[PDB]
Design an enzyme around this catalytic site. Structure first.
Site, PDB file in Angstrom:
ATOM      1  CG  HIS A  40     -35.539  -1.383 180.529  1.00  0.00           C
ATOM      2  ND1 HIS A  40     -35.148  -0.795 179.568  1.00  0.00           N
ATOM      3  CD2 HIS A  40     -35.045  -2.430 180.915  1.00  0.00           C
ATOM      4  CE1 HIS A  40     -34.100  -1.095 179.228  1.00  0.00           C
ATOM      5  NE2 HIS A  40     -33.864  -2.314 180.004  1.00  0.00           N
ATOM      6  CG  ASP A  84     -36.402   2.032 178.323  1.00  0.00           C
ATOM      7  OD1 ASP A  84     -36.642   2.208 179.688  1.00  0.00           O
ATOM      8  OD2 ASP A  84     -35.983   1.385 177.879  1.00  0.00           O
ATOM      9  N   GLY A 170     -28.131  -6.128 179.715  1.00  0.00           N
ATOM     10  CA  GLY A 170     -26.879  -5.590 180.401  1.00  0.00           C
ATOM     11  C   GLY A 170     -26.312  -4.324 180.012  1.00  0.00           C
ATOM     12  CB  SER A 172     -30.551  -1.993 179.636  1.00  0.00           C
ATOM     13  OG  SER A 172     -30.937  -3.324 178.914  1.00  0.00           O
ATOM     14  N   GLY A 173     -29.600   0.988 178.913  1.00  0.00           N
ATOM     15  CA  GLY A 173     -29.344   2.281 179.503  1.00  0.00           C
ATOM     16  C   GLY A 173     -28.154   3.037 179.012  1.00  0.00           C
TER      17      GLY A 173
END
Ligand SMILES: [Ca+2]
Length: 218
Positions: A40, A84, A170, A172-173
């Site tokens: 995402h 994801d 922020g 994320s990942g």
């Protein structure tokens, strides 16, 4: 990262910053040419920044490498956020030091109550220095207790029901490393640090075959 602490310069060598002019996501270096992140977080242009602590000041240990390939998981779901996970191939081979190192893929799936280390430049309510967070892996049932019928197979909960400590926008990942293994990827949740709504993370344990196949194919 909410309710965490400043990591300390380059103590998280696998932690990278996904950049497109400004930081938007995090990632994990798993080998010299591949960064793993969240599906995402995908966009056409992505520059991977390694060896960072303060992403607003050049400190002399950074590596700025653009992405050659951005391969989103073929079975990624935009609603349920199933699978994801995303893979990034660097334009050039990353030079590995003690400040820039790889993180090991899941040897196996981790137990419930495994002490982990979540990190990222995401919101604390973006900071400049990398934020660290030590949180345990919650059980599959407790993860489903918090998110009734929302939790799939490739998802687990890592954090707290007490609230105050969680991943946010922020982050994320970003990586969730438990005992030398990248077990979780910062995926989603209901806001941040709210009670009985811990962060949900992509279960990297179920993708080692997919990740490795993709690397060999590219
Ligand atoms: Ca810097």
């Amino acid at each position: 990262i909410v309710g965490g602490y400043t990591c300390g310069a380059n103590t998280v060598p696998y932690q990278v910053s996904l950049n497109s002019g400004y930081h938007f996501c995090g990632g994990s270096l798993i080998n010299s040419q591949w960064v793993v992140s969240a599906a995402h977080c995908y966009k056409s242009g992505i520059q991977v920044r390694l060896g960072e602590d303060n992403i607003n000041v050049v400190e002399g240990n950074e590596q700025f490498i653009s992405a050659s390939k951005s391969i989103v998981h073929p079975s990624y779901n935009s609603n349920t956020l199933n699978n994801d996970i995303m893979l990034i191939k660097l334009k050039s081979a990353a030079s590995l030091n003690s400040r820039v190192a790889s993180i090991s893929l899941p040897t196996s799936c981790a137990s419930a109550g495994t002490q982990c280390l979540i990190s990222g430049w995401g919101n604390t309510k973006y900071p400049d220095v990398l934020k660290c967070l030590k949180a345990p892996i919650l059980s599959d049932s407790s993860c489903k207790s918090a998110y009734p019928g929302q939790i799939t197979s490739n998802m687990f909960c890592a954090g707290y029901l007490e609230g105050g400590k969680d991943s946010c926008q922020g982050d994320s990942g970003g990586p969730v490393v438990c005992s030398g293994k990248l077990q979780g990827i910062v995926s989603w949740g209901s806001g941040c640090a709210q009670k009985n709504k811990p962060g949900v993370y992509t279960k990297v344990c179920n993708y080692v075959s997919w990740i490795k196949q993709t690397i060999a194919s590219n």
